[PDB]
Design a protein around this ligand. Structure first.
Ligand code: NPW
Ligand code: NPW
Ligand code: NPW
Ligand code: NDP
Ligand code: NDP
Ligand code: NDP
Ligand code: K
Ligand code: K
Ligand code: K
Lengths: 6, 489, 489, 489, 6, 6, 6
């Protein structure tokens, strides 16, 4: 979750 | 987000080129996560001359030497500074650029990276840009859009003549409204939101949001062990008529299924009997009417029933005639309880009544009802979040404008719900949601919170249906509500 | 239990120090069972100056050399003899005691053993004792309470200003009422009852008990193979009105689902038709009333229906008006059958009628109804087991006072039910229980036995609901009753 | 890599700040992959005043607002430009920096990010830098080193007074020699090599490499179906003596187990019989010697046996005396076949003989043998890859200098092998490797290729041993060789 | 069950 | 494998 | 292991 939220 | 970039560069001091590099590498990592190992694929990167194309040059440069093939088609007439710097690195790194697009070009590539237009799109796409977007949409290749599929207006989700249909969209910092409203939501495909280095304080300051699982989890009311039915509140639902005897049952069970302590319906006799023949846990009070519809002669009895409850829902299945109009408006003018106003109570509503009311209200129209209420066309109100914000603010209410993406706003805060499927596109599903909202208010959530939690759960219940969504009916939806609650924790 | 200790020491001859050692080692074994291997943890033992702290010194001494760290904070001003002896052993064994508590102390420990106050608590906790309990409650450490979480009154379960919230409580010999009634039940966390050496004869002599699985298993009536519906008795349920047409259905199915042979409802026409439209196995007799409510004109017909049954339940959904009051009181005065009296029959009941009755009765109020019946506040009657005992004894009845912990008493024997969850905090759940009780009486259990078995099973059925408890409705509860029966054997 | 950075910035045009950002975010992603979700952890970032600390400020800034806590201890006296820019962003983003280190500081953090020194380390660490590194090494926290654990010399792997022991090291572009040679290899922990944007052409130009699975897979000789034993070559192994009768068996089976067609041993009678009593598939030719050792009287017979083979291995178990020295040097001077020279043939070797030879040779010393051969101490030759390069180049050979990391070089190309475990630290394991190499040469791989493939496989076979590695013996290693081959494809 | 009831 | 080699 | 060693 540091780079991407979905 | 325009604002967010500018502040991050100009006040926080982050070089624009660093943000651009971070954007591009996000797209590469997002693609790998979706396609697995990239080294087998051939990539066609389509770059406009703005910063969206600049991100695309970062992508292309980072694939050089690692994948089977990369080619950039540059479609612009000039380049912004960052786009130019990045174009320069791509070429210094050995990258191939062409400026002329040929329809057979698609034949020799597996993935199209769409970096033509992002948030800088203005007006309709025509000419070559369009011919290219149509070619990509016919090609059946894997399409990855940088920031926003080109041709979607990022503030509205409208299609500006034509737009790319993406399998994957990678957006930066926050989802844009155009990924959330349709048709844009549809053209976006799978959406990933990448952190590209903006300060978290700025990302958080964004005043319009997607309702998430976490936000709903933390709004769900507590169930202390030492409690009783009065702990969980009382709802009255004023609903139904000789024409619509089922709507009340759907609304009442909506309240009971979200955890309300006690639900009473006031429905014209003998239609009130239908509810307890299906669900005997409901209380269904017979209202003596003259012709099968509520009217002024029922005002006093309903205000009496209202004294012993925490919230009143009104409108499902009432009918739209003069006597209903007189009754609904005098009732609401006098009721000093929170009101959830749906369906035919909206169709006869005098909006002056909302202004003069001290107690709160939630209105839950679909766009056909909203259209009639503010005297506009369906197409002018649909997905019109600014119109909804203004109506909520002016009338001191919460407005829940239902559609595949539902908008919930009190005029200050606006939330977007994306749970659900087309099984909810069927009569009855709205009558359930009305009871859910009334129910969460009775349990102590604020009108905006009750609405936030209800639209999410109502949509999520539909997604848990075991068979094909089109066969979903309101009764089955009711049965799935408690599973949605459980899955939410 | 005060009595039990004293007799075990003074008449049986068990040294007080042996009981104390046994108490302390129970706590160590209970902790190991819950935390697994203890040797990794650091323990902060908080000891008052009474025998509760004495148990705590036993605990601390037994952890010396086996765990990462032990420290005792002694908060008392003087020590009872056993506390002193134990404090002496702790120190001789190399143990560290401090007398001053510092808020950062919690930082360096993983588990707090709460041995400040047990059954010797008297009046409100204030001053340092309180500041310490608040610090522990804010700390998020694992909390293990010796005997009773400090601050819970062990005879009532009330919180005396402030109380420890425990993950685990280890109590000696028997559960205390304060572990069973709320809020105490909540602060207790997981409860273990340790045998510390009292003679079993004394442990058994305890006259107030928790209803257990084993006790319910052995009260369940037999189902001999050669039987027929008359074997399993006949119930009449007098229920309902023009306002409450579903309550009767819930009560009737409650009787059928626990195994009753034949159930008839007497409900005002046409509301009686609702029951068989949902459950056609029910018999629902139409009662011709004037205004939709039972009254004196129905007395003779209902006494006639009563001749052919074994038990009559009355009250669910009757309405509370003068004509219902006249009818309910004349009926009960003349009925020479066991009566289960619920809901609106309780709200209009003249309690002189219970005294003059030869046949037995069970009353099933919630605290709002009990309050009105004896003319006290809800807060004066809630969890008031002595008031319930006195009312049962004076009126020659069984009283089932429903709440998260339900009290069942006939004035001599009082039982506490702890099965259930908040899904029962919803209208309709009481109407089911009334039929369950009537049903078990019809099958030959005594009124107290029928009530004991019914509250357990009714609570256990709720716990078997597959989805989130708040979505549980009376109809779903009905469907789970037979699974609860099966699981009980 | 110094060179690589400079060229990427100065000739390719990549802003130094972009490379630094890319470095820092790699470390964050590497940590997440290893620790899972980061948001629970507290991070202590230790930054020197060079570019290594600059990477650390990037890390710290990117954790702000996303994890429980970040603090930077800045230990330098001044800052390079990129370090300064990054320090500036960290603070503008709300980051906390302190300049004074207190030993209790470690108490309040879970992960230490070590960004004190990377490749700019020069000379011994002393003073505070050292006290801090010792504190970190005693703390038992999770340690993540940026580029190189601070205190490891990146060109040699030596410890410069003291060094950080890392759980995870993230290095940029390529592994450094200091991650590959010991003790550095040990202090590195788990190593991740991040792509930070260097052109792939430059990354590839790096002339010293780690032997990987892929490189060994593509060097493995082909096994065409239509083949016979002559397809796969013939080895002669000249080995053994009255003192060392087992070494020859280990070398011969080493050749057979890697797929050689025909292996013959020439061993003094009756010691030659030992080989076929254990492995009857071996041919073991009896050599009539005077005293149990090879000597000049055996020269002619061994040159004859040499005519019918493709490669000759010599040395295992020969003995080190004058007659062996005379024989080994005259043989090698006259043998016009590729020679694999091990063990006691190395101990008596005259290196003038290697120079005058037309045919190729591979020497396989351990550091004790290499030391004697070039007349230096064991500690001067151990891990001395430049000395090995120079010796290979001067003597026209391939040198395989065996140790936990083995160095294989022909003077132009140098490879490092990191497969294996301490089960190979046992007599006999070298004798196996000698036969493996001879065997792959017989199958047509070049001397350097044969050596590359053999050290990898020999190490990998040891890792496949089922039980504890210390119990691994040469015979068991032989049995695992074919499993290593299979697993390699 | 000799030591503990639950 | 785009970001990391192990 | 607090009570018994085996
Ligand atoms: N089982 C029952 O008892 C049920 C009872 N129900 C009760 O029926 C009552 C009437 O409700 P309603 O929505 O049908 O008509 P109303 O509010 O007059 O709509 C205005 C016009 O808008 C249109 N339109 C319709 N839907 C639209 C949409 N989603 N988005 C956009 N446009 C939409 C449609 O126009 P048309 O298709 O004719 O062009 C319609 O005439 C209401 O009291 C409800 O509670 C229903 O809930 C069903 C189950
Ligand atoms: N589907 C149907 O047909 C159903 C029909 N039902 C029928 O409705 C009739 C009325 O029953 P009832 O309990 O609602 O009111 P009643 O006995 O007058 O209570 C006195 C007052 O006490 C309160 N209070 C309420 N609950 C409490 C509690 N647990 N613990 C403590 N306090 C509590 C509450 O006060 P309030 O919340 O207004 O302050 C209430 O006014 C009854 O005949 C029943 O069978 C219901 O069973 C529902 C399903
Ligand atoms: N089963 C058989 O038949 C076997 C037979 N074998 C045959 O024995 C012969 C002698 O071989 P070798 O290595 O024992 O001694 P040699 O070459 O004189 O070494 C020079 C000196 O270096 C040292 N030293 C030793 N190892 C080291 C290391 N890894 N790294 C660094 N230093 C090391 C050690 O010194 P020390 O420990 O005495 O200080 C040693 O004296 C050889 O022909 C071999 O094939 C063996 O293979 C075993 C199984
Ligand atoms: N931040 C990153 O950069 C992006 C924003 O970059 P920014 O440079 O603002 O804008 P974009 O890259 O999103 O788009 C601007 C480019 O598109 C052109 N353009 C806009 N609309 C049309 C149209 N209807 N027909 C043809 N050309 C059109 C502009 O040309 P012109 O300058 O001629 O108007 C300009 O080259 C974000 O999406 C994100 O990727
Ligand atoms: N048997 C075991 O021993 C226990 C019973 O031991 P026993 O010694 O009776 O009693 P406890 O150890 O339960 O409690 C008595 C101690 O608490 C003090 N105390 C009671 N109430 C307060 C208050 N409200 N504020 C401050 N101090 C208070 C008493 O002080 P004081 O003597 O001053 O009243 C005494 O030191 C059982 O729980 C079990 O553990
Ligand atoms: N590229 C990235 O940047 C790194 C290279 O950055 P670069 O700036 O060259 O160098 P580093 O950041 O690796 O190290 C240079 C810093 O360490 C100091 N230093 C070196 N040796 C010692 C020592 N023995 N004792 C105390 N201080 C010492 C230097 O001080 P001084 O300037 O005083 O010599 C300087 O502040 C790579 O590792 C990678 O992370
Ligand atoms: K785009
Ligand atoms: K206690
Ligand atoms: K470092």
């Amino acid at each position: 979750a540091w780079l991407f939220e979905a | 987000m325009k604002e967010i970039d500018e502040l991050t560069i100009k006040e926080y001091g982050v070089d624009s080129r660093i943000l651009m590099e971070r954007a591009g590498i996000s797209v590469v990592l997002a693609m790998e996560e979706e396609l697995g190992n990239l080294s087998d694929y051939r990539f066609l990167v389509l770059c406009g001359g703005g910063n969206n194309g600049g991100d695309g040059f970062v992508v292309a440069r980072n694939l050089l030497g690692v994948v089977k093939d990369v080619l950039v088609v540059f479609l612009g007439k000039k380049k912004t500074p960052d786009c130019e710097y990045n174009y320069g690195l791509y070429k210094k790194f050995g990258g191939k650029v062409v400026e002329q697009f040929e329809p057979s070009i698609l034949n020799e590539f597996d993935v199209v990276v769409d970096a033509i237009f992002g948030t800088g799109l203005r007006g309709e796409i025509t000419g070559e840009y369009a011919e290219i977007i149509n070619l990509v949409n016919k090609s059946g290749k894997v399409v990855v859009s940088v920031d926003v599929p080109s041709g979607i207006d990022s503030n509205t989700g409208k299609v500006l003549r034509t737009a790319v249909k993406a399998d994957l969209t990678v957006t930066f910092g926050v989802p844009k409204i155009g990924h959330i409203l349709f048709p844009g939501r549809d053209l976006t495909g799978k959406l990933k939101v990448a952190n590209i280095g903006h300060p978290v304080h700025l990302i958080n300051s964004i005043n319009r949001y997607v309702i998430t699982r976490e936000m709903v989890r933390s709004l769900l009311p507590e169930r202390p062990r030492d409690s009783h039915k009065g702990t969980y509140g009382k709802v009255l639902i004023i609903a139904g008529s000789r024409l619509y005897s089922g709507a009340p049952v759907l609304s009442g069970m909506g309240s009971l299924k979200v955890g309300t302590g006690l639900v009473k319906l006031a429905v014209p006799f003998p239609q009130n009997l239908i509810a307890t023949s299906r669900f005997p846990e409901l209380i269904s009070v017979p209202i003596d009417t003259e012709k099968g519809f509520f009217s002024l002669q029922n005002l006093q009895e309903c205000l009496e029933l209202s004294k012993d409850v925490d919230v009143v829902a009104i409108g499902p299945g009432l009918g739209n005639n003069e006597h209903v109009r007189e009754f609904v408006n005098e009732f609401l003018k006098t009721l000093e309880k929170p009101a959830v106003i749906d369906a035919d109570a909206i169709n006869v509503l005098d909006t002056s009544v909302l202004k003069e009311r001290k107690s709160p209200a939630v209105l839950t129209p679909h766009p056909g009802e909203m259209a009639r209420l503010v005297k506009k066309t369906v197409g002018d109100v649909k997905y019109n979040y600014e119109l909804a914000e203004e109506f909520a603010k002016e009338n001191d209410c919460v407005l829940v404008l239902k559609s595949a993406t539902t908008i919930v706003t009190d005029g200050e805060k606006t939330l977007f719900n994306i749970t659900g499927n087309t099984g909810l596109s069927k009569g009855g599903s709205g009558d359930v949601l009305t009871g859910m909202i009334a129910g969460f208010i009775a349990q102590g959530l604020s009108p905006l919170e009750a609405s936030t939690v209800s639209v999410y759960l109502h949509g999520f219940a539909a997604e848990l249906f075991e068979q094909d969504e089109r066969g979903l009916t309101a009764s089955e939806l009711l049965r799935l509500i408690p599973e949605a609650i459980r899955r939410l924790k």
